[PDB]
Amino acid sequence: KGKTANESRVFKTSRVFPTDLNDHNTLFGGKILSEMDMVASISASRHSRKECVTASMDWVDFLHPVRSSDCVSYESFVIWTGRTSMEVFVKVVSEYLISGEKRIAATSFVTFVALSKENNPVPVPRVIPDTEEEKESHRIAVLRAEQRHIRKAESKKVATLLTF
Amino acid sequence: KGKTANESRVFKTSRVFPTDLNDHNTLFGGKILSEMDMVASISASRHSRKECVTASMDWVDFLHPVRSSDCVSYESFVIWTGRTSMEVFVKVVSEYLISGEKRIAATSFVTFVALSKENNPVPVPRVIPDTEEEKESHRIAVLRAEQRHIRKAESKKVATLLTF
Amino acid sequence: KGKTANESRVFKTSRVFPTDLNDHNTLFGGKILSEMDMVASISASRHSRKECVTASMDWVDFLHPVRSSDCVSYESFVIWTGRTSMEVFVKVVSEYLISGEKRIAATSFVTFVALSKENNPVPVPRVIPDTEEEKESHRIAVLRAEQRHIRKAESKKVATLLTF
Amino acid sequence: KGKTANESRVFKTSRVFPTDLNDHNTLFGGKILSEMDMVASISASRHSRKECVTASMDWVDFLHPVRSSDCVSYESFVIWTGRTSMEVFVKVVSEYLISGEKRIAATSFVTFVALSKENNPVPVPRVIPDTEEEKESHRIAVLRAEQRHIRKAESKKVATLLTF
Amino acid sequence: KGKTANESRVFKTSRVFPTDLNDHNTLFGGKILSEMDMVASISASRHSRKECVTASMDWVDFLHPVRSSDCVSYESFVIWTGRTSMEVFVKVVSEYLISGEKRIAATSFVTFVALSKENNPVPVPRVIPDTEEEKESHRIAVLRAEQRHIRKAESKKVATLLTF
Amino acid sequence: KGKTANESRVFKTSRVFPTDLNDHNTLFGGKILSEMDMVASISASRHSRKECVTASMDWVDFLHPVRSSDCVSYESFVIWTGRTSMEVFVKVVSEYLISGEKRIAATSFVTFVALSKENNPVPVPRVIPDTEEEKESHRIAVLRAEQRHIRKAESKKVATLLTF
Numbered sequence: 008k009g010k011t012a013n014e015s016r017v018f019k020t021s022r023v024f025p026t027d028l029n030d031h032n033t034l035f036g037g038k039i040l041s042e043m044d045m046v047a048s049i050s051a052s053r054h055s056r057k058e059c060v061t062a063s064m065d066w067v068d069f070l071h072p073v074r075s076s077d078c079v080s081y082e083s084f085v086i087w088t089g090r091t092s093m094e095v096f097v098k099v100v101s102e103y104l105i106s107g108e109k110r111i112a113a114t115s116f117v118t119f120v121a122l123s124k125e126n127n128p129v130p131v132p133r134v135i136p137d138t139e140e141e142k143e144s145h146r147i148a149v150l151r152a153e154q155r156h157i158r159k160a161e162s163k164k165v166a167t168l169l170t171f
Numbered sequence: 172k173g174k175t176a177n178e179s180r181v182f183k184t185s186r187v188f189p190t191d192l193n194d195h196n197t198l199f200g201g202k203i204l205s206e207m208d209m210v211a212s213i214s215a216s217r218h219s220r221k222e223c224v225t226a227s228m229d230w231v232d233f234l235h236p237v238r239s240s241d242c243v244s245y246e247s248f249v250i251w252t253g254r255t256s257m258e259v260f261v262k263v264v265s266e267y268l269i270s271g272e273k274r275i276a277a278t279s280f281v282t283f284v285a286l287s288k289e290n291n292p293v294p295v296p297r298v299i300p301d302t303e304e305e306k307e308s309h310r311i312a313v314l315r316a317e318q319r320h321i322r323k324a325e326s327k328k329v330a331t332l333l334t335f
Numbered sequence: 336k337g338k339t340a341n342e343s344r345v346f347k348t349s350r351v352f353p354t355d356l357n358d359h360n361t362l363f364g365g366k367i368l369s370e371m372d373m374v375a376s377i378s379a380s381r382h383s384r385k386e387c388v389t390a391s392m393d394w395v396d397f398l399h400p401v402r403s404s405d406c407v408s409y410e411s412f413v414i415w416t417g418r419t420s421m422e423v424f425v426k427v428v429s430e431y432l433i434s435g436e437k438r439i440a441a442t443s444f445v446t447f448v449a450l451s452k453e454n455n456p457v458p459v460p461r462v463i464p465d466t467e468e469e470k471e472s473h474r475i476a477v478l479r480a481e482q483r484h485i486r487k488a489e490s491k492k493v494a495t496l497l498t499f
Numbered sequence: 500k501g502k503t504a505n506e507s508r509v510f511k512t513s514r515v516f517p518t519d520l521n522d523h524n525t526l527f528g529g530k531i532l533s534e535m536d537m538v539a540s541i542s543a544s545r546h547s548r549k550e551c552v553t554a555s556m557d558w559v560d561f562l563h564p565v566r567s568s569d570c571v572s573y574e575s576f577v578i579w580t581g582r583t584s585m586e587v588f589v590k591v592v593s594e595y596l597i598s599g600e601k602r603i604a605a606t607s608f609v610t611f612v613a614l615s616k617e618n619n620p621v622p623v624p625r626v627i628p629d630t631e632e633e634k635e636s637h638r639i640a641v642l643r644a645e646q647r648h649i650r651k652a653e654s655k656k657v658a659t660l661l662t663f
Numbered sequence: 664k665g666k667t668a669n670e671s672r673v674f675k676t677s678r679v680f681p682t683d684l685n686d687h688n689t690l691f692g693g694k695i696l697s698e699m700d701m702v703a704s705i706s707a708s709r710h711s712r713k714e715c716v717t718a719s720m721d722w723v724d725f726l727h728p729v730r731s732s733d734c735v736s737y738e739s740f741v742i743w744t745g746r747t748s749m750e751v752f753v754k755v756v757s758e759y760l761i762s763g764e765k766r767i768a769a770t771s772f773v774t775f776v777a778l779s780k781e782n783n784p785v786p787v788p789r790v791i792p793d794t795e796e797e798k799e800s801h802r803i804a805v806l807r808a809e810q811r812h813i814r815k816a817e818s819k820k821v822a823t824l825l826t827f
Numbered sequence: 828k829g830k831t832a833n834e835s836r837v838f839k840t841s842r843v844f845p846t847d848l849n850d851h852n853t854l855f856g857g858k859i860l861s862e863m864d865m866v867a868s869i870s871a872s873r874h875s876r877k878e879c880v881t882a883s884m885d886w887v888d889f890l891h892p893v894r895s896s897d898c899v900s901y902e903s904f905v906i907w908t909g910r911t912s913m914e915v916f917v918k919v920v921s922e923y924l925i926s927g928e929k930r931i932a933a934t935s936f937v938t939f940v941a942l943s944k945e946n947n948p949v950p951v952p953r954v955i956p957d958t959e960e961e962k963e964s965h966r967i968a969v970l971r972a973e974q975r976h977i978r979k980a981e982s983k984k985v986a987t988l989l990t991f
């Protein structure tokens with residue numbers, strides 16, 4: 008059938024623990040990436056109701072730092088779907104505990120592929136964008152889903168050229 | 172002044188813990204993304220001898236699943252430098268315990284920027300690619316750095332349209 | 336200077352990891368308890384915009400199991416205030432991965448107290464219930480608070496007769 | 500077939516790590532709650548010699564702060580039994596590192612239910628209070644149990660009026 | 664002055680989590696070692712009431728495996744003291760959750776040195792063994808404290824001979 | 828048949844997280860002990876291609892503190908073999924971030940034994956020391972293996988006298 012983007016929306020707001028802070032009192036980029044993928048993998052399975060796997064991560068720019076005085080929240084939902092794969096948009100917002108001042112520290116698209124119990128890609132519902140914002144994000148996702156093939160190709164190129 | 176690429180090479184092999192396996196008995200991409208950033212940040216500070224901050228992560232294609240029957244290894248090192256930014260390359264290899272066979276699970280570049288105590292971009296030594304493979308990876312790190320301005324324009328755009 | 340209950344509302348959806356499961360593939364009650372306080376503390380500072388300390392945890396009944404086949408969601412918000420304290424409501428929703436089925440696995444009230452950098456209870460804004468659900472939860476909260484002095488006197492006595 | 504309360508007694512002393520401290524260098528209540536259930540579940544299986552599921556957590560008052568300057572100790576034991584359930588008592592003692600000073604930081608009753616591999620409540624041995632402390636805690640437990648059906652009916656109703 | 668060995672006794676019983684189990688369903692030796700040192704460092708500070716550091720680990724033999732069906736408990740206390748250092752005995756016992764069958768999986772002595780806020784070794788109370796068992800363990804500790812110097816010496820020898 | 832030592836060499840560099848720092852801003856010995864075992868177990872299975880179990884750990888002298896201002900690196904590899912047991916050598920190097928200077932923080936040997944699915948010691952390839960340094964470390968691993976029988980008699984004794 009077909010599912011609304013909001014059917015797969017996932018929210019997660021966390022505290023900023025010292026473990027994840029580097030020397031400059033800002034999160035390690037990895038912490039954010041690990042979390043983006045995590046919250047997105049949940050969106051992937053909510054939409055597909057299948058056991059998903061992460062195929063790719065779109066480039067990510069860390070627009071602002073997220074410090075200990077901050078608070079991070081992630082939001083994610085599926086916006087674009089292929090036959091077997093789906094693109095999950097992820098939004099990361101930091102919030103000052105005393106000010107309330109929020110600001111988006113990073114965003115990205117994570118691609119997931121639904122698999123059968125025997126590693127066979129499996130059809131996935133279609134997404135249907137409601138909000139005006141969701142429609143814009145879907146347009147962007149459409150364009151990002153086109154370069155996907157070039158990227159993969161470049162990735163396979165670097166691989167073969169490499170030593171283990 | 173000048174610093175060999177290998178003078179910042181960083182290794183790391185770990186087992187695959189159940190904690191990080193999805194419902195398909197494979198690693199969450201997030202786990203790998205975090206390790207790539209982690210290991211890469213060490214390379215960055217080893218080279219700059221200033222503690223660094225991750226500025227952005229390049230696109231990442233998860234070429235092969237990493238299972239509990241494997242163990243992952245991460246290799247990373249600087250292969251490009253600007254004034255205060257460094258392009259760090261990272262490769263991920265999966266190794267089958269009993270068979271002994273390896274596979275590049277993924278690769279990428281993570282851009283780090285060196286900062287002062289007062290959080291200001293500070294100069295960083297130039298990197299000197301020795302090996303043929305290093306030269307080729309540097310040849311590529313260059314193309315990536317050349318597109319960093321448009322990649323950022325793409326991100327700043329999405330952030331702009333987002334409402335939170 | 337009166338905040339709407341929704342201004343302190345906090346969400347979090349997580350997967351159910353093996354580490355938090357006993358031999359019945361059900362979460363340890365403790366895991367849920369920990370996440371309730373966490374999520375409720377973020378609500379407390381969202382609303383008080385001060386760092387908060389948890390004063391007491393209302394009694395908690397684990398109505399249903401939370402298996403590896405589910406994902407857990409936590410929702411919380413300030414629903415009652417005194418002078419320097421807040422009663423934060425928290426609801427735990429268990430959702431079935433492949434079937435989309437949901438149930439409340441538990442609910443509770445966590446009481447937080449705002450403190451100054453000198454460990455002194457500081458005044459906190461008043462909370463305003465909007466929806467019917469919020470108005471109802473508020474009454475339940477009013478009742479809970481009407482008896483906290485008793486609960487505490489009971490706790491103090493037990494500590495009294497204890498040899499450590 | 501009647502076990503002494505002491506046969507299920509469990510101890511644990513831990514340091515206070517930065518990760519579990521809020522901005523007041525006091526433990527998150529949740530951390531303590533988690534450790535109480537953990538330690539109490541080990542007592543439950545020590546006594547029932549079956550894998551146990553946590554049914555409910557009695558109300559909990561955090562009488563004192565637990566700072567990084569302390570170490571926490573947890574003690575627990577079965578102090579009441581029904582047919583298939585047990586009420587496990589738990590006391591949290593905070594001890595000052597350089598001064599040796601101790602205080603009860605919290606106490607509580609955690610209720611566990613023994614289950615068969617088919618998720619069925621199984622009979623558990625009867626517990627025998629020995630010391631005066633144990634006999635007293637037992638009476639308090641008897642009272643707690645006399646009202647659990649009410650507490651649960653109250654929890655079920657809240658879940659009822661909740662929209663998720 | 665002088666303190667009884669029991670003044671520093673520390674108990675800790677834990678569950679065996681999957682994360683720490685290797686491929687053969689037995690704990691990684693590291694998990695046990697990390698824990699022995701941990702519980703022992705607590706004994707060290709309880710006795711010395713000083714901030715301690717771990718100087719050495721005596722060899723450790725893993726007599727039996729500790730599986731998921733097991734339960735581990737550590738016990739530690741100071742038995743031998745120098746002027747500035749102290750030897751902490753550590754006992755590790757696994758217990759079958761269904762049988763109750765206990766057995767000691769490993770034991771060892773960990774040496775700690777009390778330090779002043781400026782890294783200067785600092786005098787430590789004297790230990791006084793009460794139990795007959797404690798007296799035997801103290802005799803053994805006395806002999807182990809003699810070879811300490813040879814060991815250290817061999818350690819320094821291997822170090823200098825090594826490449827970084 | 829035959830396998831080079833380096834064919835099992837394993838590297839690993841990590842940052843020093845606050846979680847593992849004692850009250851003296853230095854690593855808990857336990858943290859290091861765990862990493863030495865971890866890294867060494869990988870070396871063991873890389874060599875034997877059978878998953879291994881840690882049999883014993885050699886004495887360990889903590890020659891230098893490892894601070895938050897450093898980052899630790901672990902190198903390990905097999906340098907001695909018996910029929911089914913392997914002597915794995917492990918070195919720990921601390922590296923000062925800003926200065927760039929290194930120090931051997933500790934070193935040791937960890938004995939691993941290869942097991943079948945049915946938990947039976949299974950034969951393991953011989954190890955071939957190449958480098959001069961390897962030969963010297965093997966020359967030593969031999970002396971250690973020669974005393975393993977008395978080291979075990981010492982441990983079995985302590986276990987015998989212990990009452991639990």
Ligand SMILES: CC(C)(COP(=O)(O)OP(=O)(O)OC[C@H]1O[C@@H](n2cnc3c(N)ncnc32)[C@H](O)[C@@H]1OP(=O)(O)O)[C@@H](O)C(=O)NCCC(=O)NCCS
Nearest residue numbers: 060061062063089090091092118128197198232233236237
């Ligand atoms: C390639 C992989 C993603 C599975 O797909 P596949 O074998 O290539 O098979 P298919 O060709 O049928 O792929 C189906 C979908 O893959 C998607 N896809 C494959 N590679 C992709 C890439 N790197 N980036 C984005 N999408 C990709 C395509 O969009 C295609 O979508 P569609 O049907 O919607 O149009 C796979 O090799 C894999 O399992 N890798 C990751 C598994 C994992 O464990 N991930 C974590 C890393 S350890």
Ligand SMILES: CC(C)(COP(=O)(O)OP(=O)(O)OC[C@H]1O[C@@H](n2cnc3c(N)ncnc32)[C@H](O)[C@@H]1OP(=O)(O)O)[C@@H](O)C(=O)NCCC(=O)NCCS
Nearest residue numbers: 033034036069071072073224225226227253254255256282
């Ligand atoms: C990167 C950052 C430090 C500096 O931005 P700035 O204040 O704009 O820095 P400047 O413009 O003075 O100079 C920036 C240097 O960083 C580079 N840079 C800035 N943004 C970048 C980006 N998104 N990707 C790659 N490099 C970037 C610039 O190219 C420049 O490089 P160069 O000197 O070699 O030529 C800032 O974006 C930041 O703190 N981001 C947050 C990073 C972080 O802490 N987050 C981790 C997770 S929250």
Ligand SMILES: CC(C)(COP(=O)(O)OP(=O)(O)OC[C@H]1O[C@@H](n2cnc3c(N)ncnc32)[C@H](O)[C@@H]1OP(=O)(O)O)[C@@H](O)C(=O)NCCC(=O)NCCS
Nearest residue numbers: 388389390391417418419420446448456525561563564565
């Ligand atoms: C509760 C506590 C936080 C405040 O201290 P206090 O001495 O009771 O201070 P006050 O008398 O001013 O109480 C202030 C508020 O605390 C509330 N409160 C106090 N004890 C409470 C109890 N334990 N349970 C619930 N609420 C409590 C009171 O209602 C009062 O509310 P009000 O302002 O609306 O009227 C104090 O008990 C404490 O510091 N405990 C610390 C617990 C902690 O740090 N938690 C972490 C776990 S270690």
Ligand SMILES: CC(C)(COP(=O)(O)OP(=O)(O)OC[C@H]1O[C@@H](n2cnc3c(N)ncnc32)[C@H](O)[C@@H]1OP(=O)(O)O)[C@@H](O)C(=O)NCCC(=O)NCCS
Nearest residue numbers: 361397399400401552553554555581582583584610612620
């Ligand atoms: C409580 C539960 C465990 C047992 O189920 P049940 O349907 O109530 O089964 P029973 O009627 O036989 O109850 C058996 C025992 O449970 C006790 N009990 C049931 N519900 C309880 C409640 N929530 N609080 C405290 N004790 C409870 C009853 O007193 C009874 O005790 P008894 O044998 O001495 O008389 C069930 O609610 C459940 O499976 N919840 C699972 C919670 C869980 O798995 N915990 C992990 C967190 S997700």
Ligand SMILES: CC(C)(COP(=O)(O)OP(=O)(O)OC[C@H]1O[C@@H](n2cnc3c(N)ncnc32)[C@H](O)[C@@H]1OP(=O)(O)O)[C@@H](O)C(=O)NCCC(=O)NCCS
Nearest residue numbers: 716717718719745746747748774784853854888889892893
């Ligand atoms: C050597 C070290 C242990 C401190 O002591 P020191 O500088 O050698 O100074 P001292 O000579 O005065 O040592 C005092 C005690 O050290 C003890 N000691 C030192 N090295 C020891 C060793 N490896 N094994 C057992 N005991 C040792 C001695 O028993 C002496 O004891 P005593 O007074 O009771 O008789 C130190 O170099 C160090 O800080 N290392 C570990 C610190 C740390 O952070 N540990 C975790 C590793 S990262």
Ligand SMILES: CC(C)(COP(=O)(O)OP(=O)(O)OC[C@H]1O[C@@H](n2cnc3c(N)ncnc32)[C@H](O)[C@@H]1OP(=O)(O)O)[C@@H](O)C(=O)NCCC(=O)NCCS
Nearest residue numbers: 689690692725727728729880881882883909910911912938
């Ligand atoms: C080591 C162990 C597997 C085998 O003991 P066993 O049943 O006595 O083994 P066998 O006697 O058949 O043969 C033992 C091989 O292991 C070696 N071994 C046994 N105990 C050893 C010890 N304490 N230290 C080093 N090697 C030991 C023997 O030397 C022999 O080596 P070899 O074949 O090369 O010459 C057994 O002690 C064990 O399972 N221990 C627990 C290890 C573990 O799982 N624990 C990890 C933390 S709990």
Ligand SMILES: [Ca+2]
Nearest residue numbers: 011012013137
């Ligand atoms: Ca929608």
Ligand SMILES: [Ca+2]
Nearest residue numbers: 667668669793
């Ligand atoms: Ca004594």
